Design a protein around this ligand. Structure first.
Ligand code: CLA
Ligand code: CLA
Ligand code: CLA
Ligand code: CLA
Ligand code: CLA
Ligand code: CLA
Ligand code: CLA
Ligand code: CLA
Ligand SMILES: CC1=C(/C=C/C(C)=C\C=C/C(C)=C/C=C/C=C(C)/C=C/C=C(C)/C=C/C2=C(C)CCCC2(C)C)C(C)(C)CCC1
Ligand SMILES: CC1=C(C/C=C(\C)CCC[C@H](C)CCC[C@@H](C)CCCC(C)C)C(=O)c2ccccc2C1=O
Ligand code: SF4
Ligand code: SF4
Ligand code: SF4
Lengths: 54, 82, 30, 733, 95, 154, 81
């Protein structure tokens, strides 16, 4: 849900905007953000480990 | 001829704004010492500024400094062309 | 191949930082 | 509630951020944090700054290695005229094309900033010519700067002593140093310039292959060892040189003699070497002055001892300055700082007027962003010099051990010391400020006449003794000759130290009433700056308002309200306060050169002369003239050659300004709204459960006096950085 | 004009005042004792200064200056030579 | 004479200063007081800076370039009283500011309690003390060194 | 140290003198007379923050008192929370 967000933000407001490329409209850089984002997310799950399977 | 003073007064405020207090004490005595040798000071215990007075002499100066700076900057670009 | 020496600014100015801002969040924990 | 980064425990606990911020900014304060023993500490600074030297060579390596695939020599030697020789290539993805505008510089493709740093004239400046001859640079320096780490460890590890006691001698060391080090460190240099470099300067080249085959001479070192020495200096050069090619280059190493040059300024190649040689006896004769367990010479106590020029019948002690300075390690690191501090400017004020370098000054941008990175610093030192000699007084220092005894006595008769200091300032205060407003009330009153200016003898007079030459005088008993010097003459001072009057590049520029003020306002700087450092230092031990103020002597910033009201009254917060005037002297001073120089270069001189005199129009021209160029690199109709600089120059005005927060804010207001602003999450959805490891806080009550500063400073020092360059580059001068 | 070898004559006046004691009495440097390993302890930190030991050499080794300085510098020094030199030797006067 | 160029008797650069400037402040062809009784550039403000003239006095007076005067103050030639004459004057006047500073002060501390006399001021300027200051001949200049304030008071 | 700011004096009498301070001080220990003879610099101090409200009133007649623990709690902070 948070996924297909961050498109027109960086495909319609992109650095040199309104693109003529196959890529954007685009995954592009944004797909790069979910990676930075998603692990900035993990090294917070080192605040809790508390470790199990129940 | 103002625009230099008051563009000075402002850049005097920071001294009042940016500084300690038992400092100008610690200083005010070295003074008070030299004073006593010649026999010229004690009466009316000379004292540094009242923590918040020091702030009172920030601000107030920072404003009548930083302000008349433009009161000058202005009246000097409407008198004469404009 | 022609004109291609662009890696020692992300590995450094970008990725090296990733390492440590991650990694060194060892200051919090490890 | 975890246990965490260690040396401290005190620190190791608070959740609140202070744990990080602080984490970094004890690291360095070894004495008396958890670990430390007099054997730990010492070594724990020794294999530290073996981690030094080490980082100075990974700097130097790359300095020589972002040169010689790109950014000329093999064009800058070919013959180098004030256009734009390069350090390095800029590479930023943010750039526009308008990058095509320099952001690229004639010959090279890459856009680069090119060098303001001194070297290009020194790598060249002795030999080291050849663009097929060099990539060497790191290769060495680095196959060095790693060894720099190796002892680090080797001498780390106990087996082969890191050695505790050993660190207190002196005599042995410094009986070693100022011979072994300096002396042979010179010599060896005297060596190099002479076999490999002077030959390059006149030169034709040395070739890599032959050391033995290359001789300076035909019949070889020649008696020399035999002393004639003299006759090196016959027909050493021939002034009308074609420099580095002969044709009249000549070959007798070394001189006094011939020329200031229209081609080169600076310092005849030979002379920087007999000198380097010449001094290399005195230090070698000096080294070997104190003991090393053979039984010759001197022991460092017992000359200080009962020694003493005055009184002897006075009543002031000498006794153990040596184990109180030896035992201090702060006395140490503060006679260290200064000397370096006093000489860092003697370096940098002699390096102009007397630059050692082919094609420098009259390169004359790089001559003006190199006097100052040695004026900043140098000032930046001095403070720290004065600041480790008010830590000696608190952490170390021993009132019973010291007493009657001259360093003591300095505390004792101290109230005077700050007063006959503060009396200098207050005088040097209003009296410079009468002269400069008066000088500005007059004008724009439109009587310029009835200006008050002293044309200020005392210098002009020095520099008669030297000369020349401006319009005579006799000066009774010199007389412009008759009494000449007579004892001395054709030998020594020759043509040299005779530029005379010489507008273009004299050495000595011709001083008047504009210089009889700045010169009294640099003097009101280091005085005020030092009444506060002298004071700062003297009672770090503390006074009346605080008797106590100790066992943290240094940074205990703040105290409770009441008594009179007590504040920045730690010897750190006077150091803290000091650094503003070291950023105000080291500003009046630098400010001064440049305006002067600037004007000197397409130069009226006149202009400083009437426009040193008064304060307004120190803005108007200079400061207001000559931002000119930089402020549009942006200018709306597109971007012109310098853009880094002007954006830096506003980066300059922000970093500065944003100091003030830190500086007019004071932890109380900040902490409290963070008390409300940490009711958000704890209260507001999708933000919750979610735990900081560190509790929100507002910065401690010393911390922000620093940070505003270490913030005030960059802005400030990054603005003139960007200002001067962004204006000595176009010019006009 | 300049008596250059006026003073290099002069400085190895004094460091031959160095050729000194390595030779004569005892093993050398009068020890080491103190230098590696280190001092008692000592700890002022510390000794040894005597205003009295200017005697011994000042009269003996007053000569040394001369020995090069005299006849050896401006000597044609070590004229009384020859003594195995096929590869080559001389060393022929620069005077 | 000493470098900055010489006095009034000739300082062309100085001459050019006399002239343009003021003389032009003139050069508003008129602006009209053909009788008129008020507006005073006209008379003096120029003439009071202007009937400054090949005379000024004479004064020597060094005139650097741009012919603004520089003051050497050596003890020579003409120039002696550009510091000493108005120098001892500064000294004499001050010191008889503070000779009486060390006076409408060393006169109290005394009797029945004197804790802030000082903020009202019986008699003002001390006065009485005041004239002590011109009637210093010598005054402190020996009495400070001996007796009264005396090393013991030190 | 972990709270060490000396307010001591000599009278340590506490009538029309000093009381102010959030918890920290129970004193009234006596020591074998001083006139009023309630003495000491302190009760056990591992409880509260760092005022100098501690003098402001009733003598210390050398140093004021102040910030200084360094070694700093959260409860001793105000904020954790
Ligand atoms: C040549 C250097 C010399 C040496 C060998 C030392 C050695 C020492 N100094 Mg010191 N000092 C020096 C010069 C030196 N100093 C100078 C020149 C000054 C001022 C001019 C100081 C001012 C100073 C202070 C106030 C203190 C020391 C302290 C110390 C001791 C602990 C070090 C520390 O706290 O760092 C740890 C610091 C860090 C790990 C980094 C934080 C530093 C900040 C302020 C960064 C500085 C600005 C920075 C470059 C800007 C950011 C870069 C920008 C491009 C983003 C250690 C004995 C401390 C001490 O023990 O005294 C009791 C402390 O009080 N020094
Ligand atoms: C905080 C600052 C710092 C920084 C960043 C710099 C940076 C610079 N300084 Mg500098 N300087 C500083 C502090 C600093 N300085 C201080 C405190 C002083 C006063 C002591 C100086 C005094 C100074 C001088 C006099 C000069 C510079 C110069 C320079 C520039 C030349 C590059 C260089 O230094 O390579 C550094 C190179 C090395 C570290 C290697 C060379 C060292 C040799 C001497 C080692 C000898 C060991 C040898 C192997 C022993 C031989 C034994 C055997 C063979 C017999 C560079 C801009 C130069 C310049 O003018 O540029 C135009 C020069 O003029 N500086
Ligand atoms: C531009 C500046 C402003 C001014 C005018 C001053 C002035 C002064 N500072 Mg200072 N300071 C400032 C900004 C300023 N500071 C800032 C921003 C900081 C850092 C934040 C500091 C940090 C600092 C320190 C650490 C110290 C000083 C000290 C001093 C005094 C040193 C003595 C001297 O120089 O001659 C005397 C003063 C002048 C030339 C300024 C003019 C004062 C007179 C002439 C007032 C004019 C009278 C006027 C006609 C009447 C108007 C008043 C009213 C009736 C309308 C001086 C009063 C030191 C000191 O206390 O000396 C004992 C020392 O403690 N300053
Ligand atoms: C130029 C100034 C500097 C800056 C940047 C700020 C900024 C701020 N002050 Mg402030 N302040 C300053 C000087 C400054 N002050 C001074 C000198 C004083 C007194 C002399 C004060 C007295 C003061 C008070 C009393 C208050 C503030 C408050 C604030 C905050 C207001 C909310 C806001 O809009 O912040 C955010 C916006 C900015 C800081 C400006 C934009 C910054 C740009 C450059 C963007 C950079 C972000 C980017 C991602 C960088 C990452 C790149 C990477 C390389 C690091 C804000 C943090 C108030 C507050 O906290 O209310 C919320 C509070 O009322 N200030
Ligand atoms: C022109 C631009 C570009 C494009 C092609 C899109 C396209 C889209 N955006 Mg979007 N967006 C853009 C720029 C763009 N955005 C920018 C610059 C922002 C600034 C934040 C957003 C913020 C945004 C949000 C918050 C959302 C979208 C949503 C959507 C998608 C749903 C279409 C819709 O209205 O639901 C059709 C609904 C029904 C048929 C019922 C759609 C694929 C989402 C969405 O629109 O869902 C309602 C989601 O709402 N966008
Ligand atoms: C401390 C160093 C000194 C400095 C200030 C710089 C600075 C720079 N180098 Mg560099 N470099 C250096 C030494 C230095 N170098 C040395 C000794 C080498 C040979 C190994 C190189 C080989 C090198 C290359 C190939 C490149 C750069 C590039 C750069 C630029 C981008 C940063 C980067 O990714 O470098 C990469 C640095 C290395 C691969 C060297 C690693 C060696 C270690 C020991 C140094 C790390 C020290 C660290 C401060 C701690 C930057 C201007 C890049 C460029 O051209 O962009 C404009 C390009 O990528 N450098
Ligand atoms: C610290 C002081 C400094 C000194 C030494 C002087 C000295 C002088 N000023 Mg002056 N002035 C100063 C600061 C100073 N000023 C400042 C800060 C201002 C701005 C408020 C002025 C504004 C000013 C004006 C407007 C005038 C002077 C004038 C004068 C001269 C007249 C003295 C006189 O009438 O003697 C006569 C009596 C005896 C010798 C007895 C004298 C040379 C006057 C002048 O004529 O120009 C030189 C002119 O009125 N000054
Ligand atoms: C600033 C101060 C001071 C210093 C450091 C020197 C230093 C020097 N003077 Mg000197 N001198 C001085 C004051 C000083 N002088 C004064 C006041 C006079 C006037 C009596 C002289 C008259 C003088 C003469 C005549 C000569 C020197 C010479 C010299 C140099 C060599 C002396 C020597 O051979 O042993 C040496 C650089 C000699 C020299 O080398 O100059 C060519 C020689 O010419 N001096
Ligand atoms: C010029 C001349 C000359 C000479 C010169 C000289 C020789 C000198 C000088 C001067 C000097 C010689 C100076 C010095 C300076 C120094 C300094 C400035 C230092 C400083 C510092 C300090 C004072 C410190 C202090 C401290 C403290 C704070 C406390 C305790 C500790 C310590 C010590 C750290 C000649 C020969 C050519 C001749 C002619 C003239
Ligand atoms: C400089 C400074 C001082 C020192 C400032 C002082 C001591 C100013 C007070 C000076 C007074 C106004 C001089 C009064 C003397 C004359 C009025 C008496 C003679 C009367 C005349 C006729 C001249 C502080 O006390 C202070 C306190 C708190 C925060 C910052 C600072 C601060 O920055
Ligand atoms: S912060 Fe204010 S109240 Fe607190 S100690 Fe400092 S000056 Fe006093
Ligand atoms: S505040 Fe001081 S004087 Fe008062 S009771 Fe406490 S210790 Fe005694
Ligand atoms: S403010 Fe000080 S005296 Fe008062 S309770 Fe806290 S620590 Fe104790």
């Amino acid at each position: 849900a948070h996924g297909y967000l961050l498109v027109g933000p960086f495909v319609k407001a992109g650095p040199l905007r309104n693109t003529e490329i196959a890529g954007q409209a685009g995954s592009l850089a944004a797909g790069g953000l979910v990676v930075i984002l998603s692990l900035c997310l993990t090294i917070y799950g080192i605040s809790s480990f508390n470790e199990g399977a129940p | 001829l103002f625009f230099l003073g008051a563009h000075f007064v402002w850049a005097f405020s920071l001294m009042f704004l940016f500084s300690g207090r038992g400092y100008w004490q610690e200083l005010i005595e070295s003074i008070v010492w030299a004073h006593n040798k010649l026999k010229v000071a004690p009466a009316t215990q000379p004292r540094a500024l009242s923590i918040v007075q020091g702030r009172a002499v920030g601000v107030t100066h920072y404003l009548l400094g930083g302000i008349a700076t433009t009161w000058a900057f202005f009246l000097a670009r409407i008198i004469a062309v404009g | 191949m022609i004109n291609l020496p662009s890696l020692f600014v992300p590995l450094v100015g970008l990725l090296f930082p990733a390492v440590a801002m991650a990694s060194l969040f060892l200051h919090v924990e490890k | 509630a975890l246990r965490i980064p260690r040396f401290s425990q005190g620190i190791a606990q608070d959740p609140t951020t202070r744990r990080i911020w602080f984490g970094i900014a004890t690291a360095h304060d070894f004495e008396s944090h958890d670990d430390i023993t007099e054997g730990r500490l010492y070594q724990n600074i020794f294999a530290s700054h073996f981690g030094q030297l080490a980082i100075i060579f990974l700097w130097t390596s790359g300095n020589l290695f972002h040169v010689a695939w790109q950014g000329n020599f093999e064009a800058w030697v070919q013959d180098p005229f004030h256009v734009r020789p390069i350090a390095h290539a800029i590479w930023d993805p943010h750039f526009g094309q308008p990058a095509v505008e320099a952001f690229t510089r004639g010959g090279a493709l890459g856009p680069v900033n090119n060098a303001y740093s001194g070297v290009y004239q020194w790598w060249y400046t002795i030999g080291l010519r050849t663009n097929e001859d060099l990539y060497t640079g790191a290769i060495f320096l680095l196959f060095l700067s790693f060894i720099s780490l190796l002892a680090g460890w080797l001498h780390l590890q106990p087996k082969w002593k890191p050695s505790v006691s050993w660190f207190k001698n002196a005599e042995s060391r410094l009986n070693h140093h100022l011979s072994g080090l300096f002396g042979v460190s010179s010599l060896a240099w005297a060596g190099h310039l002479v076999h490999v470099a002077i030959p390059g300067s006149r030169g034709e080249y040395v070739r890599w292959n032959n050391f033995l085959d290359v001789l300076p001479y035909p019949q070889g070192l020649g008696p020399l060892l035999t002393g004639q020495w003299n006759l090196y200096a016959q027909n050493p050069s021939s002034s009308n040189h074609l420099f580095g090619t002969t044709q009249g280059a000549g070959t007798a190493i070394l001189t006094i003699l011939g020329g200031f040059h229209p081609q080169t300024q600076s310092l005849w190649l030979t002379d920087v070497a007999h000198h380097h040689l010449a001094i290399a006896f005195l230090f070698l004769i000096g080294g070997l002055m104190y003991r090393t367990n053979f039984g010759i010479g001197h022991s460092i106590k017992y000359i200080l001892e009962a020694h003493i020029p005055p009184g002897g019948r006075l009543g002031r002690g000498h006794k153990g300055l040596y184990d109180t300075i030896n035992n201090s390690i702060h006395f140490q690191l503060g006679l260290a700082l200064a000397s370096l501090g006093v000489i860092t400017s003697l370096v940098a004020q002699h390096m102009y007027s007397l630059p050692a370098y082919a094609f420098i000054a009259q390169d004359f941008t790089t001559q003006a962003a190199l006097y100052t990175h040695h004026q900043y610093i140098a000032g930046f030192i001095m403070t720290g010099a004065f600041a480790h000699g008010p830590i000696f007084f608190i952490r170390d220092y021993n009132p019973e051990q010291n007493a009657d005894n001259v360093l003591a006595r300095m505390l004792e008769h101290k109230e005077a010391i700050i007063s006959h200091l503060s009396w200098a300032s207050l005088f040097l205060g209003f009296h410079t400020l009468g002269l400069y407003v008066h000088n500005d009330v007059m004008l724009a009153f439109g009587t310029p006449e009835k200006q008050i200016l002293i044309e200020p003898i005392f210098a002009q007079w020095i520099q008669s003794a030297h000369g020349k030459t401006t319009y005579g005088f006799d000066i009774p008993l010199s007389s412009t000759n008759g009494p000449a010097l007579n004892a001395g003459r054709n030998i020594w001072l020759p043509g040299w130290l005779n530029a005379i009057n010489e507008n273009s590049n004299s050495l000595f520029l011709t001083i008047g009433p504009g210089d009889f003020l700045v010169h009294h306002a640099i003097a009101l700087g280091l005085h005020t700056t030092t009444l506060i450092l002298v004071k700062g230092a003297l009672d770090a031990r503390g006074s009346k308002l605080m008797p106590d103020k100790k066992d943290f002597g240094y940074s205990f910033p703040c105290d409770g309200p009441g008594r009179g009201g007590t504040c920045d009254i730690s010897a750190w917060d006077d150091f803290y306060l000091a650094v503003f005037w070291m950023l105000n002297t080291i500003g009046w001073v630098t400010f001064y050169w440049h305006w002067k120089h600037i004007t000197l270069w397409r130069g009226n001189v006149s202009q400083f002369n009437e426009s040193s005199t008064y304060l307004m129009g120190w803005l108007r021209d200079y400061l207001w003239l000559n931002s000119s160029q930089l402020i549009n690199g942006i200018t709306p109709l597109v971007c012109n050659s310098l853009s880094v600089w002007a954006w830096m120059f506003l980066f300059g005005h922000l970093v500065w300004a944003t100091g003030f927060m830190f500086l007019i804010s004071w932890r109380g207001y900040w902490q409290e709204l963070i008390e409300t602003l940490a009711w958000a999450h704890e209260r507001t959805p999708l933000a919750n459960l979610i735990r900081w490891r560190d509790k929100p806080v507002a910065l401690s009550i010393v911390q922000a006096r620093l940070v505003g500063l270490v913030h005030f400073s960059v802005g400030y020092i990054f603005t003139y950085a960007a200002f001067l360059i962004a204006s000595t580059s176009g010019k006009f001068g | 004009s300049a008596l250059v070898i006026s003073l290099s004559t002069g400085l190895s006046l004094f460091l031959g005042r160095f050729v000194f004691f390595n030779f004569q009495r005892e093993n050398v440097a009068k020890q080491v004792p103190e230098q590696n390993g280190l001092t008692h302890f000592e700890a002022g930190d510390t000794r040894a200064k005597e205003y009295v030991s200017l005697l011994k050499s000042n009269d003996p080794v007053g000569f040394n200056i001369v020995d090069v300085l005299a006849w050896g510098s401006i000597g044609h020094v070590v004229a009384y030579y020859i003594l195995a030199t096929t590869s080559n030797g001389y060393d022929p006067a620069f005077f | 004479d000493i470098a900055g160029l010489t006095p009034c008797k000739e300082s062309k650069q100085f001459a050019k200063r006399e002239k343009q400037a003021l003389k032009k402040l003139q050069a508003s062809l008129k602006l009209y007081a053909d009788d008129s009784a008020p507006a005073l550039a006209i008379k003096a403000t120029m003439e009071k800076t202007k009937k400054r003239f090949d005379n000024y006095g004479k004064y020597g007076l060094l005139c650097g370039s741009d012919g603004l005067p520089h003051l050497i103050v050596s003890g020579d030639q003409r120039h002696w009283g550009e510091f000493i004459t108005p120098g001892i004057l500064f000294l004499y006047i001050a010191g008889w500011i503070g000779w009486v500073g060390r006076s409408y002060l060393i006169a109290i501390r005394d009797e029945k309690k004197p804790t802030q006399k000082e903020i009202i001021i019986d008699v003002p300027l001390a006065s009485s003390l005041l004239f002590r200051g011109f009637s210093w001949p010598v005054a402190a200049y020996r009495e400070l060194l001996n007796g009264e304030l005396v090393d013991n008071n030190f | 140290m972990s709270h060490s700011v000396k307010i001591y004096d000599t009278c340590i009498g506490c009538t029309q003198c000093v009381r102010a301070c959030p918890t920290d001080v129970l004193e009234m220990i006596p020591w074998g007379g001083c006139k009023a003879k309630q003495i000491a610099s302190a009760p056990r101090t591992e409880d509260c923050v760092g005022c100098k409200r501690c003098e402001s009133a009733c003598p210390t007649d050398f140093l004021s008192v102040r910030v200084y623990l360094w070694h700093e709690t959260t409860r001793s902070m105000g904020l954790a929370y």
